[PDB]
Design a protein around this ligand. Structure first.
Ligand SMILES: O=C1N[C@]2(CCOc3ccc(Cl)cc32)C(=O)N1c1cncc2ccccc12
Ligand SMILES: O=C1N[C@]2(CCOc3ccc(Cl)cc32)C(=O)N1c1cncc2ccccc12
Ligand SMILES: [Cl-]
Lengths: 305, 300
């Protein structure tokens, strides 16, 4: 029993974190095989950030301008290239701790673990969801750039996020490991803002199933609803639309608990229209949307890595 | 910016998790140097869980009755001894991945990371706190016994918890790594219950300071309180008493934010009286008590 915000074990990723310094800027790099990936903004001064021409700034750098430190060992940079907003530093040593890995770009609503790092040293691990507005509500201080987000599927680490910036509202923006930003963000010190966010409906439903599995049923009711009537309610309360794909994905949890997905939608509809009435669900007074249906099944079944 | 429930990176502990089997029971063990630590209840059969005589059950076991698996490699048990409720299996191989470590017994209110494991394989990491009633609100299924709780301040792993059981309310009980249970619990299936739990006041205050550091001040007020009046009010909401030790511990956060501890106590009193009025504090509609003053300073 119990339901916690759980991250994947971070050990496979910890063995890849390195420190990357370029001039006065120090941030984190991800060392996989003979390449260290890091935000391309490591080459910018504060003034360069106002309107950077990364190709022009990079052509001026030599390999020896990138100091890469893996623990207390300096790696030698033997080449450098840019892919979108990520800099790829070719090093002379393959990381012996390189796990089986892939680079995957995730969709909004998908969750991942973030290994927050400073100076190439991991400091904490937490679970995030890619918000519908393409930001993440992370916990990052100055020096955290280059920290990565990932999932593990069996023995394979799927890297999905690399940290680049903090927006004025305190939320975060980054890229996939191919350097493509999530969301309409750019790596430049210019006016940027997180758009209006929405709640990840399929994830709230998954968490209500987790609550039922853990013995909380107060919110259940005799009612059901159609997908169109529920979607009219979701639109009204700034919830993401629930698709037939989401309903199919929730099938296993629907079969296990005996609560049909649309039956749980009628529970969610009543919660949106009336609130919790002083009650809590899994120790929360808010509807939690950062657990996917897969996370719920994984935690309530004990899948290991 | 941002404030998350953050666990320590688990890699140093992942390299210590092993599977321990005795008869039909399989659980997790913590392999450090040449010793595998695990709950002594691994030696119990179906007829032993109500009034086990662990000394009597253990004397009957030979080293080859303990099957220890580290990855896909069977470790050879060459000795065994019991220390309180933990079994210590001496193995013929020191764990090459043994980190710098210590065993620390924590006090209620302290937080730690849990690396939940099944069959010696880590499945997830989460943060939790030792509740005032000596239980933890963990996430553990059958087979999670032997999963450990730890902190990793300054590259040294301080192991503070080893999981043993789930109480009827769904909360969890365990021991320190010397096998001493936290709370009045016993490794027996006899009727046991978590005592009435309370909110960790010092941690709620620490989290309100985190909220102020992160730019949220809506809950502040023009009032202060005496420590004793605060406690009289707080006790009525099932909050733990706030001691002068807690006030001293909150000194650094008070100096950083400019909000006196007793002024923050007045804000807490008002939050208890009023609720949040549709507002949130650090993304929460409830007052969070699983961040210590030390965690707040570490994360901010
Ligand atoms: O290190 C950087 N450089 C920044 C600052 C300048 O403006 C930009 C503009 C674009 C880009 Cl891609 C990065 C940056 C940025 O946000 N971060 C930070 C990342 N995350 C958290 C931060 C917490 C406090 C302080 C800075 C943090
Ligand atoms: O593995 C065990 N053995 C138990 C079962 C019998 O009663 C006792 C009594 C004393 C002791 Cl020390 C252990 C045990 C126990 O609680 N757990 C479990 C631990 N944690 C979570 C569990 C989630 C579901 C099911 C069982 C879980
Ligand atoms: Cl302590």
């Amino acid at each position: 029993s119990g339901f916690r915000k759980m991250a994947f074990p971070s050990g496979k990723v910890e063995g890849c974190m390195v420190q990357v310094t370029c001039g006065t800027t120090t941030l984190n790099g991800l060392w996989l095989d003979d390449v260290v990936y890091c935000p391309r903004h490591v080459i910018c001064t504060s003034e360069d950030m106002l309107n950077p021409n990364y190709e022009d700034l990079l052509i001026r750098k030599s390999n020896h301008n990138f100091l890469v430190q893996a623990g207390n060992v300096q790696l030698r940079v033997i080449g450098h290239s840019m892919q979108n907003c990520v800099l790829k530093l070719k090093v002379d040593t393959a990381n012996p701790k390189t796990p089986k890995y892939k680079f995957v770009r995730i969709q909004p609503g998908q969750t991942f673990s973030v290994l927050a790092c400073y100076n190439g040293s991991p400091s904490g691990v937490y679970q995030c969801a890619m918000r519908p507005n393409f930001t993440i509500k992370g916990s990052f201080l100055n020096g955290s750039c280059g920290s990565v987000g990932f999932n593990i599927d069996y023995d394979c680490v799927s890297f999905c996020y690399m940290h680049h910036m903090e927006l004025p509202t305190g939320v975060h923006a980054g890229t996939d490991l191919e350097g493509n930003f999530y969301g309409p963000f750019v790596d430049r010190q210019t006016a940027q803002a997180a758009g209006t966010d929405t709640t990840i409906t399929v994830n709230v439903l998954a968490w209500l199933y987790a609550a039922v599995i853990n013995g909380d049923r107060w919110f259940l009711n005799r009612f059901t609803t159609t997908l169109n009537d529920f979607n009219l309610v979701a639109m009204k309360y700034n919830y993401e639309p629930l698709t037939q794909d989401h309903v199919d994905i929730l099938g296993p949890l629907s079969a296990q608990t005996g609560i049909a997905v649309l039956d749980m939608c009628a529970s969610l509809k009543e919660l949106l229209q009336n609130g919790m009435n002083g009650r809590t669900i899994l120790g929360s007074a808010l509807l939690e949307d950062e657990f996917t249906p897969f996370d719920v099944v994984r935690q309530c079944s004990g899948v290991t890595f």
